[PDB]
């Protein structure tokens, strides 16, 4: 069902009819529309019973690292830097006798992970409020709706 979600979102994007665009600084309307569609789709997923979303919310784009995070605002430079950045069966059968690249899949996945983090933050803002939004930003401490998210399907850790 994970690849099901991937294909569903990619089909929705193709309906939108779009790395190149991210570096395409002047394409602000496109970026706003795509992030709008993505936020609506994530709202649909995390809330299967609530599909309605803010159909007109303000947007903005940042371009400098001082305007970068280490009305929706986006860190265009960093995201551009990112986008630019079984045996037995097959042996048994060896004796029995519009394309998307894998790196593009990685890019789309990183985009989705960043956007779902941003949408989690946005949801925190909407329900808990602006202050507890800032608290979540300062402290990011899943499954409680959340099952509709592919993030809960994989875990990443750190070690010194």
């Amino acid at each position: 069902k994970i690849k099901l979600a991937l294909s569903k979102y990619m089909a929705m994007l193709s309906t939108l009819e779009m790395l190149e665009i991210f570096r395409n600084k002047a394409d602000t309307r496109q970026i706003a529309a795509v992030v709008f569609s993505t936020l609506a789709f994530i709202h649909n997923r995390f809330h299967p019973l609530v599909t309605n979303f803010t159909n007109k919310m303000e947007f903005v784009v940042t371009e400098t690292n001082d305007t970068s995070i280490p009305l929706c605002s986006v860190d265009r430079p960093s995201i551009v830097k990112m986008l630019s950045r079984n045996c037995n069966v097959r042996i048994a059968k060896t004796f029995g006798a519009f394309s998307i690249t894998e790196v593009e899949a990685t890019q789309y996945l990183t985009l989705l992970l960043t956007v779902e983090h941003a949408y989690l933050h946005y949801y925190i803002f909407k329900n808990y409020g602006v202050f507890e939004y800032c608290k979540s930003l300062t402290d990011h401490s899943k499954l409680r709706k959340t099952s509709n998210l592919l993030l809960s399907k994989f875990k990443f850790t750190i070690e010194d």
């Binding site: 983090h117 990011h140 401490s141 499954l143 993030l151 850790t157």
Partner: peptide, 17 residues
């Protein structure tokens, strides 16, 4: 770049299901 102390644990919370 920002000369900023990093929080491994906050990132883990971002990616701790």
């Amino acid at each position: 770049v920002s000369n900023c102390k990093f929080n491994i644990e906050d990132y883990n919370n971002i990616f701790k299901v």
